[PDB]
Symmetry: C7
Subunit: 253 residues, 7 copies
């Protein structure tokens, strides 16, 4: 009866050694990066090569391994699952790096959060915000949301709704602004300006100002000076900016 | 006992070479596009053709490869899974390109974000916004939301709720507007206008103005001038636009 | 040893030709519709018919194809997955077309977005809005939301909360409206009207008007004119519509 | 060598005819319902029975069909997937019809949307709303939300927060209402009433009125008349309903 | 050649009858419940036992049924999937009934919707609301949300933010309330009361009243009467409850 | 021909008995806990042991069981799926009990809902709220949300924004509070206090008060007394807490 | 007939003992950590090694184990599924620990919840909040949200919108602040300051102040003092900070 019975501990041990050489070529070509990693890829690659060796050695004896493989299968599957989201941050980065419509130094607006890019981690992306802290956005997140590059086009629009005296003229202000526009140093004339009465206001009339500028000096800055001159001028032309107006009627009871 | 034992390293090497020719016909008809790409499709196509050759070579020896194939399966599956979303951006595009109710130069409103289209990447779509930065919308997202083409129909409605002296006549204003409508240059007569009292207001009476215009020189221009003349006229007819009215009653305690 | 060694290149090629006749009966009964489509269904149908032939030909040699099949499988699966959502827009339409509670020319209100229907694409659905732009709603989206047909029933209710002098009588107004109701040309008498005091208001008393009308010439027109006469009459009966009333008490400190 | 080689076109054709008899017993006991349906179930049932007979006929030749079945498998799966949601509208209906806590003529409140039921489609459900349009709610949606039957219980509570002069008595009004309650024709006495001061108000004192009534005649009218009487009475008892009170203190600067 | 060819119509019919006895022992121990149910479980159990008999009979002939079983599998799978959510309402109920931290007669607040329980259907749960209509919540929904039993504990807290004259004393009101607390018939002394100044108010100072009561005759009653006494008392101690106070400063322009 | 034909009813019955002994060792070591459970685990364990015995007995006859196993699998799978979420409440608990960063008597804030813990059911978790009712939170929910233990750290911060006469001094109040702080019995000195001007207010200046206290006698009380002293003192130092200030300008029209 | 019949109870028991040695080397290497854990891994590893032994011993008899394995499979799968999310908290942590862009002592802002990190549990993460309670964030959650490290960059921006007399000069305040900036001890000069008129206000004009500071002493104190000096100075320069301005018009009716 003997050869099977022997062929088993022949095989079982033949591979069982190969658990050392592959726990230690795991530890050889990748270990001494971290304790956590050297003993995780050397624990798992090991125990795995082990359980494959056990299953295989029971197979040479003539045992039904269909039952164990069903368990190993349905194990491996809960594993496939834990790492779904992590590995999708990984191939998130793989696709990001490879196909990039984004690269380091650009500034963007991922999901409402705008900052200049600092890092393309294996799984993570890092922004140093205008706040100046560093957000660490997992690649998974990034690769699928609307990535809004601000850097990829050199000029950007600017806007207002500058409330006037609700009683000033359609063209008075239409020229005081058309004048302050020009007096601006930081402004483009090749890019149009749409400055009209946008809407009836509650206590003030509201003028939109659409203007363009260059990415280079602007941020928010240009808008702040634009207003500092459309004040210096609207204040100057005996043109009113109204505090909330209210029409009181009085009656006693 | 020998032939199996030999047929193994026969086979094993036979294919094992074929790891060079397909690491290097991977590197041959695809590489030199990028370091990342050339060593990723050449690392994976390789390591794969390798693990297939090992398994096959152990199969010629008479070994149960059901155990390893179960692991290879349940690996490949975690892989199937990481690339679900990416590859659904890809065939997103494929469908997008092929079936298009959209094409470059059109302006649309994908998910609240309106801009003219600049790019149909493999996975990505790019809009230069009216802001003027370029959003990079993954195809996945696009192929499944409500794509609102503004370009595919030549004319668009415009609207108001123009507040009036809450005491002015139902037909007075009904004609001052029917007059300013006509005096407008940029305005269609073949397309209806619905200008009636929409609602009782809190401090003002509210008139809707529904009007149509052409895509060609419209957007916002038309509406802003429309208002610039419905003020130039409503201001002109001794018709009041009210600041918020309030009926104070007084009593002491 | 020969025959299998030969039967391989027999078979392998036997089918390998059939890669041409099915690359080009792919290109024959389907191509010339587009470059993207003719070379996509002719690339894929091809490469596939190829990898099936390879696998088959290694099978006639006595090679374990379990390893490759497991990869082919786990590939095909990531594919099954990318097209989950697209193909569910497809059979979305299939169901939509087939079982329709909806058909072209009807107006509806899919997910808050109301417009007349213009297109039933294979995947997509198109509405020309009352805006007049054309939304392109993927079938996947439509087939599963509450589809609100406005066209399927000939008559629709209309409503108000018409604020009055908070001091006028429960029946005074109850008759001025019951009078303006009748004087209306565009109104149904077979459909009831529920006009009564709905709620105590903050500065005004609030009357609901529930009235019915016909789809034919309704929408905007009816409700706006109804108000134009319930003003022409309420203004006329020395019945007040109040601006926000406020009871000031005064005391110094 | 012959018989296999022959047994193939034997088999292959044997079933290959059965493509006609099952394209046309598809077209026989089901078609003529529609063009879309007669040629869809006759195209698919067909191409299916075809690809089954191909695979089978290559099987009688001794070919590895594991390759093709893997593809047929992983195809069928993307199909399983497109129709997940549709078919769950179907078995949505099956469970709905079968186990119903709802039936036609009842009025309900599915997801905030209340209307009387008009249809139980195979996948869809239809309500003619109070509005009078007909919503078409897919069975999938319905079978899983909180279905709120209003018809399944004969009596319903009604409510207020009736603001009073903030200075009137805890019992004065507590009786004026207990009196208007009784004077109501449309009200139940074996159903309690909880009419107490519910909350200190900002400018007014707030009384809750909890009352019951019958489903038969209460659509809006009961609450609306209720108030038409609690006005006819509160107005009458020299009990104030206040416009927003405000205690002004004055000081100059 | 005969026996196989015969063993087929032997087998095929042998089971084929067993389609009658199992369409009719489907119809025998389960039917006459409904028409929908008796012909659904008798259609399906049948068609199924049919397609199992066809496949088996082609198997005795030596035909490859790997192709058909792949389709039968991939069908059965689109089925597993339509009934994922329904059958999880079912085992929802199974777990609910079995492990209950809830049973009929208790009142709860599932997902913001509070009512006394009336039904534990197979898949559904029914509440008669304090509205008095009966919601029908599918078991799926219930077994997984926060089920907030109100009935499982005999006493419940009550609360206020009772605005005072912002000028009254920290302890004056602190005793008027400590006095109104005791004078209440419906209150617990073994359960603490936390009545302090909670927050500076905008126009009024704000006092929290935390008090306990018994489920038996509480709900709304106790709080409404508690307030009717803390008004009867606060109104009485020359302690002001203020209408919104405002400090007007005046200057002309 | 016999033995097979006999070996079937040999086997089939051999196990078929074993349906009794395992219906009744189901009923033996588990039943009498409930009727629902004794006849559910005794119905399912049974019918299952039955369908396995049928399939096995047709296998000894030489019948293709691949058909039926395909249905048994694809059934078992719609079952795996219904109990996904229940059994994840289960192993939710298993994990919760095992690795607890939480144990009974702690108070927490799971998803906005804060209460002291009363129960760790198999699947459920119960909190008696500060309300005093008992919520029954499924383990599934808990094991995955941010579990905010309040009990696990002995001291907690407290906060204000205490509005002051917008004209008072930066240090006046800065010391009146620094004094009331000290006068407090219930307060920690080893824990810092950050009491400065946080923000310009609309009608009042706003001071934050950050202070620490002990879990022992605190929560909300210490805050309420803190304020009763910072009123007793701020009221006392001729330091104003302002009612909303408003700067009226007057002009007629 | 014997040997099979014997080989069964040979095998069955051979492994059946091995249920003791692997229930008790489960209990040997792992047990005594807890009762829950020692009898859970010793119950499951056991019952499992048991059901594998039974299936295997019926296999050596010649029984079709395809039916049982289908059930063991489809069981194992509902198990794979319960532990999806838990095990993804596990490999969440594994990836967190190994790849960290985060480490203990850093402060972050995980999903709106900012606190210093105290724990990296196997599954959980713990923050002691500014509040000072300890939140217990499951790793699953963390590894996938935007982890915002505040600690990883040494300097942070600060901001305002400091309202001024709407009538003061564009440069008056532009210098009072540029002066208060400098007078500040805790402020960086190498980091820019953008102090301009950001927007027209309703009752006040609004100045943004963008300034930088150092992580080390800043918190929220540097802003509070900044303001305490921009008050000490703005108050000082006869520069008004306005209470809400309102332009009253009066007319009687």
């Amino acid at each position: 009866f003997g050869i099977i019975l022997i062929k088993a501990v022949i095989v079982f041990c033949i591979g069982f050694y190969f658990s050392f050489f592959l726990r230690n070529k795991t530890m050889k070509l990748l270990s001494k990066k971290d304790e956590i990693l050297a003993n995780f890829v050397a624990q798992v690659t090991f125990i795995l090569i082990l359980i494959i060796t056990t299953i295989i050695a029971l197979s040479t004896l003539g045992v039904q391994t269909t039952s164990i493989i069903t368990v190993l299968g349905t194990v491996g599957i809960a594993v496939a699952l834990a790492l779904k989201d992590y590995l999708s941050s990984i191939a998130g980065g793989i696709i990001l790096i490879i196909l990039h419509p984004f690269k380091k130094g650009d500034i963007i607006e991922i999901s409402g959060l705008e900052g200049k890019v600092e890092a393309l981690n294996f799984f993570n992306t890092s922004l140093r915000l205008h706040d100046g802290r560093l957000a660490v956005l997992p690649n998974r997140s990034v690769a699928n949301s609307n990535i809004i590059n601000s850097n990829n086009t050199a000029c950007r629009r600017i806007e207002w709704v500058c409330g006037v005296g609700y009683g000033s003229d359609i063209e008075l202000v239409h020229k005081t602004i058309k004048d302050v526009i020009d007096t601006m140093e930081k402004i483009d004339k090749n890019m149009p300006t749409f400055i009209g009465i946008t809407d009836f206001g509650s206590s003030s009339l509201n003028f939109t100002i659409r203007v363009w500028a260059k990415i280079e000096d602007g941020i928010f800055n240009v808008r702040s000076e634009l207003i500092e001159r459309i004040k210096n001028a609207l204040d100057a032309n005996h043109i009113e900016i109204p505090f909330n107006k209210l029409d009181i009627a009085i009656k006693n009871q």
